[PDB]
Design a protein around this ligand. Sequence first.
Ligand SMILES: O=c1ccn([C@@H]2O[C@H](COP(=O)(O)OP(=O)(O)OP(=O)(O)O)[C@@H](O)[C@H]2O)c(=O)[nH]1
Lengths: 315, 49, 49, 97, 290, 394, 51, 52, 54, 74, 38, 117, 21, 124, 154, 52, 58
Amino acid sequence: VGYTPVNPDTSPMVAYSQYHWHYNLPQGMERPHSVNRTFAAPFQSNHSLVNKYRGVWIEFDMHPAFSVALEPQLRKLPRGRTLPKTPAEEVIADYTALAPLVDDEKTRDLWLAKVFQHCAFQRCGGAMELWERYCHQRFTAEGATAKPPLSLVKSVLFYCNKTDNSGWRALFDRCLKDGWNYTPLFDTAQWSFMLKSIGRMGDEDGVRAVLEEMLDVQADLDRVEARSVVIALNAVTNADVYEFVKKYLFNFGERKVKFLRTTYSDLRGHGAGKLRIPLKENDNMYYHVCWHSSIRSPRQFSPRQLYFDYTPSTL
Amino acid sequence: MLSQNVAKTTVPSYYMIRTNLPHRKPQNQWEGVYYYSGITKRQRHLILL
Amino acid sequence: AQHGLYQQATPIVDELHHQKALHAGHYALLINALACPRLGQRILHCDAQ
Amino acid sequence: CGVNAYEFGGKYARTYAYAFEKAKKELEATAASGFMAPSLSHEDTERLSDQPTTSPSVDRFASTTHPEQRKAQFVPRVGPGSTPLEDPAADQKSEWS
Amino acid sequence: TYELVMLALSLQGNMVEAESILSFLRSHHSEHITVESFNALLLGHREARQFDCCDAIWQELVDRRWPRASPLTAELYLRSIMDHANTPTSEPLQSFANINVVEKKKVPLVLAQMDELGVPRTHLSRVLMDEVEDSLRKFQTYRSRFYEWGRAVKQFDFIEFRRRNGWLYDLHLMKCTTKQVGPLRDFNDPDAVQGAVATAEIPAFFNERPAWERPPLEETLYVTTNKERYDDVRGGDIYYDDTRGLHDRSPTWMNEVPETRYDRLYGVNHPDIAKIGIRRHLNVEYVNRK
Amino acid sequence: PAVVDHDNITVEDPNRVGLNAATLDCRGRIYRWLRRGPFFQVDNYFRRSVKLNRDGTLPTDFVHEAPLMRKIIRLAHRGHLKAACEEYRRVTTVPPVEVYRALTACCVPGAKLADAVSIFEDGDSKLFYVSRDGEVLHNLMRCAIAARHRARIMWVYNVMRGRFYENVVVRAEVDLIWRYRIAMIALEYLLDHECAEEAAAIYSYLVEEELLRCDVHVRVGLHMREAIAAGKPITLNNDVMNATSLVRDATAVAPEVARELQRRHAQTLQNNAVEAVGAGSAPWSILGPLTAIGPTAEDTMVWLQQHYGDVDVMSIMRWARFRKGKDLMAKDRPQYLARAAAWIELLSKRNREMEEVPLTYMRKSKPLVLDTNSNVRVAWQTPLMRSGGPPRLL
Amino acid sequence: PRNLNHALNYGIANYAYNRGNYVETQDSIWEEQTASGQEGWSPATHADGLR
Amino acid sequence: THGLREKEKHDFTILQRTVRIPFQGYDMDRFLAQQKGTPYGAQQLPPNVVPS
Amino acid sequence: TALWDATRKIRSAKEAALHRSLSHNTRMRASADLKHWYEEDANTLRPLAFEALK
Amino acid sequence: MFLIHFVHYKTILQKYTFKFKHIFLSIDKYNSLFFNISGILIWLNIIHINIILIKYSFFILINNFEYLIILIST
Amino acid sequence: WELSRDEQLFWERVELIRKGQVASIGSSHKRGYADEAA
Amino acid sequence: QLQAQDRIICGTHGAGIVAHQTAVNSSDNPMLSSVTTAAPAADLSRTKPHEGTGTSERDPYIRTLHNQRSAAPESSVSQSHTVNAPTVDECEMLAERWGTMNYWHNDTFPRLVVFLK
Amino acid sequence: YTPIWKSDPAVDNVAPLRDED
Amino acid sequence: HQVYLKDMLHLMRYPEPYTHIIDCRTSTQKMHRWVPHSLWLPRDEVEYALQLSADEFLDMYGFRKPDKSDDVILLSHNGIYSEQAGWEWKKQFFQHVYNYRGGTNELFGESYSDMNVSDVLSPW
Amino acid sequence: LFQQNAYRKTPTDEHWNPYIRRSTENGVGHLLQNKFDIMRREDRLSKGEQDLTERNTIHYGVPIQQIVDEFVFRHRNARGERPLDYFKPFPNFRALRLNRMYRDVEGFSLMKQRPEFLEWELFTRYRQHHQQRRRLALLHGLEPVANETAQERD
Amino acid sequence: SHRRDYIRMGYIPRYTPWEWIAIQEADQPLIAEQIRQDNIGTSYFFSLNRYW
Amino acid sequence: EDGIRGSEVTYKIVLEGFWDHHVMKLAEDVCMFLKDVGRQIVEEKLVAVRRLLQGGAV
Ligand SMILES: O=c1ccn([C@@H]2O[C@H](COP(=O)(O)OP(=O)(O)OP(=O)(O)O)[C@@H](O)[C@H]2O)c(=O)[nH]1
């Protein structure tokens, strides 16, 4: 009785009533409850994971001989979680000079991959020359048999995305099932960077090819970084690719799709500053990603909105 | 849609005001805290592969 | 014998024993090798989980 | 001469041959996987292109999204301890010795 | 020699004799006992599926800290625990949940001991370490997480997860019990009017009409929905069970459906379906089996 | 989103980030504030600043905190552990790896292990695993050695191997060479103090990671470094590895090591045969499992190979060469010899098997035919103990 | 053979003691239960009937 | 499925209400044996059946 | 006796083959049949002795 | 072509039995202790007493939800 | 080969079943279902 | 310490107090009027581990005995304060043995007199 | 709101197979 | 439970002896092709058909009645009538009953419909 | 039948679930995997011991306390089986239990099965004599030794 | 669970049943810091001075 | 010290109810529980000890 309701735990007139347990009965537990055991939820935090590497790990496997031999050259290149500020010109000079002296293929290529990664972080454009000078001959040209070491490919790809470069499309294509079959070994961050670059450059077709492979190779869709999905989708103006992207959008999860919308509305919105290159206007893809989000969320009832104009009829 | 999604409240009325019927369940002492132990399909797949 | 090819080790061992080229510990060495423990390694990791 | 009574005769011959080849190929991968066979469920595989149409992995349920439409029989059976049977969650399936 | 004989006996599952040999050793030859006899016994008891012994021997091996336990020892004991944790009980104990999962909760204690003992935890098979890591994520949590694990956001998020997987049955907030179980009459009196002193929510399998009283398989042959009357109910229950048969059809069904070639058989107990059938025209020979 | 400026705080509060008690819309905010968790203020303050950079770099280098980190390092190098720890307290931001290195290195000479460990554990998995470093773990290990603490040695080794989460997810995993160095001093300690168990563990790890030849690889590596500064091509061959002073000298000593293995084994066999009887000599010693070594270099290597060959003998003879910086092979020959012998002895299972003491033979039994005790049993007697007697089966 | 004393209780089970002797039987049971750890010297309780 | 087995079990439980615990003898060995007709002089002849 | 020993080795080899197969074959394991282990034994498997000649 | 006529064997053997309880077997109900009510007191606007049986009452319930009610020896 | 044979069989049977329908019903028309009004 | 503990408590399914030889046949007694004559037990049938078809004591309606290993509780008799008779094996090693003063001078089987003799 | 996307074109899936055969 | 286009092509080339593909198309006027290895039980007859004995069923439809263990795949233009038929086959208890939605339209690229039903609801 | 196998592909279908997999209900046949284990089972079964595979389902039975309880409840305190001392004022905890025979009656054949007149009293006195013999034994140090051979015992 | 009278006919367990204790105890995690293992020593200098 | 007066570890569980009889009966429940669990643990330890008494190295 009142506008303030009784709280059923603290009130003995609830607790001890006939619909609950009186204090003179024997007070044991009624039934056991196993909730967590029967059907358990997987852990997904609202906050992203604080320790994760957040980059493209380039996997440095060197024989612990050349690793010691080449140390004064390698000390200038990135080691794990450490990014020395050495100017990229110098590093490339060192590779060009000293590398023909080393005899190992595997070593020369690990070293090269480090150089590429280093040049990806500084966004120096003259590093593809290195690909055409050493690797192109035995990997990409005229159906050469040789199969490049994975780390090298990851590194070059990462470089083509960081420095936006038409070249990526040629490399990526070699990684599908009939080629090197490297695509299932890519990191989630790899996909993230790829999508973002392709999106900036604006290839709907690059975007489609990449989303198809990602899906087939079972990438982690929900953990692909939202910004990069948005920038990729934003690039899609062509009727067919557009169709593809609706049908595809159904592959994300409820949550992912909600934040695809949030992120999208921010990047053309308040957070338009957050990007190094501003987005381009897609009103169509924006509207659609919002629409999709609305379709996939639970629906709420707002009767004064729906039935605002309802009039009954006696027909 | 989901048939376990079921009204927990009565139709709004003065019977909520004029009566000592409680508006929520009392807490259940023996029901554990819900917490997260479990893995995704994706994760199990990753382990197997 | 350690890789589980005992069949191929048998004639070799026979011919050694006939020439009296084996002494005390050598026999123990062979008999221990018959337990295939390079095959055991492989089985342990793959099959026997 | 009585082939056509059998499952390797006639229209079903082609199926037998198919099964035959798969078996061969499958033996190969078992020999590669250390003589521990791949998953029946083909949970083991890199690509979705790879899992065959014949695998139990393929999802045939009235609905993809809606859980109440994912049963085998008319109501939702439960395993021992009132654990969910119909569509098992990742951690309920345990492969142990 | 003795440890090989023990390992043999124990692969056979012969525990009495294995343990005997160890006893004799303990008594006469004690200073020579290696770890591999404890390993033998562990492997053995695990095979015979006696897990309390599998435990006893490990605890003992922690007390005498010599011989030093090996990563193999820790592996065998841990495996025996996982084995224990995954066995079912009989049906009498299976009504609420699978009990034996509690065993996995030993694990974070054993792991702690392995650190006191200097057994490196990273020599454990990849396999076992997967099972153990799972076991951990079921029961282990830190003082950090513990301060935050009851937040309502996380409780309700767990509810939301259960809702998207369509399992709400057990959750407290999210279930509304409806059915009440009436009292039992006495022939000592119809007169005495019973009333409820207390009320408890308990699973329906405690008291449910005995299987020989109720109709045969209900889940399969009847579609039942518990629902609420829309009309105002003066007295009596506000819920009823709408039960229809699986096979139920409109009494008017034959009009509601297009006509068939069967219709001229109407109200005939033994039709000759051989006559209206197509086989007799299709076949050249046509033997009628009847 | 609300953000607090600590420089600009005014009474006016232009950004309106404060919790105003009476304004429009305040109530749910107040309620939120009263529900906050025990560390809310602190946690939010800490996570909204101090977070890993988009490159995978640590937040560790900041201009305003730099001289403080310098000061800590400086203090630790002069061995002032308390002053350094007292400055570590006032650090707002994650301190660079160099700080953790300095601080643990300081813990070594006084044997402070508890302190080295709490330092390390502080920098690791709280602060993003700055603390996980070849060098820091190395110091940790040197303390555990200095404190003669076996279990903690195994614990540092275990930390150093790491698990999926820190290796793959965090990507902080100790460098290959450092892993080798750490495991190696741990192994010195264990083999020298005769711990067969943990020794065998670490050794099995070295076998699995293909680190058995690693020290050689490092030496070869150095000469290669010089050859590259000069401009001549470098290559990794079996010849280049067998041109090393290390492998040469071990190969030189090998026959002497073998002969010590043999002498030692013989004397052990003899002792065991005497203790058998409780003291003359028993039949036990008359013929042992060890074959006599042929007179040649290759015969020596062959002998070592077939009796001790489950271990890698050569690399052990290399590892046992230096002790506390002192080269044993070129100064004390017999000390070195006995060391290499003792180590190869401890690391083989085959040797463990052939060195066992003869034990008495256990009588099987049956229960009494006329039951009196369940504890009294009829023993079996081997034909040796009862001569005569009717012929019996097994 | 296990059955050597059988005659003394013919057709009933074999016994190694004189079963016709009450005292000897009771004694034999005593020894059996002593052998198996059911009987013997144990630390006393306040409930064990000290008198 | 008709649950007649479950009924049968329940009814067994009902029948238990009546029964005693049997007298197993003061010397139980002797008793069991004599029931089986093994001891000396304990032999019973089979009940005479009227020929068909 | 020698002949018997040899023959017994042969038979064991056959059965061994069978066993390795059963233990690694998961589809046959799916149908739960103890009978898979006994339905083909040394008598049954090939090579058959009474077929040697041809 | 057809060489033969045959009789169709099949092995229909059920030898395994898997029955799984449907979910609703384990759902909750509301159960109650039940004693014979010796008396009742209701009060909302006006108090009313009903006495079924007069004995010394060993237990007493009070329930406030709509009307105040007191179930005696309930 | 078998597919060819079995195709033809299929149409033979379809033909006869349809002719039986038309014969017994009397016309080639049928009702819909109660739900084909909407 | 019951007579025939093993046969009755550990061996028998009812613990001796359930009557397994009883017919589930219908009775004319008023209390038993609910009891219906049972169909005969199913022939080749695989039971659940806790049930039986109810034919004999060896096969009850309800299996009472556990299927695990059974072990008598650890004796509460003091093993360290109890002195047993000296064995051959113990008396050969008597010169290395460490006893209590009570072990050397024990009232029954004193070991000092043996160390000396 | 349906249809969300253009339905698949009229393509005949059986013909190519039986043609190969 | 569903059966997709992939399963359908696979079963065209590699038939299983005891899998039956059953065509539910109702009107003969609309059916011009033959789904390989299929058989014809039109939807309208199903309720009756499934209550015939093995013999009688043989006489009426000219092919053997599938046993209740066997796989039964159902077929229609859109996948609607096949569904309703499925409910019939499931109500007699048939253990494996799969509907192939989009069935004959997807196979042959025909656009036909079993029933004329439209998505739009008439305004109330 | 539909309930048993509805969409069921194989009998092992639900064996992704550990607690279903080691159920021993249908038999032990899915739990025998390598030859070794099968042979072991054969052996142990022939010796007349338990199958180890059987132990995959843990069956605790019903505990003796629960049984005795159901018995005395079904008999409404089971007064047929209680000692007459249960019916007198303040019975000690030994009068509180059922009527099982103990080991003390074992060597007395005078009383056969029905003891005649005064026999049970005689027996009662014999029993006492033995209790006193035990007392003297403990007093003077001659009691059974768990180790003892036959001459020592003699 | 076999007791059909559980709350209905007035039987309420005086002792909580073993099976239930097992379930309850098996639902919640165990806190790691409750296990209490110290084999190193006390940290005099660094511990009380650790990161803010 | 011997008997009741000495130990390695002591646990005191302090139970608190709103009604006296509640707390009394809870104490009987928990008490009987720890009696059983205690006996099981201490019995296990006891067998380990009896084995260590029988023999072992150093
Ligand atoms: O999700 C996020 C959040 C933030 N940022 C941050 O946005 C800043 C500028 O935003 P951009 O996303 O335009 O820069 P970018 O492509 O050059 O950055 P990378 O991701 O290639 O490094 C970047 O320098 C990065 O720090 C992201 O890149 N992604």
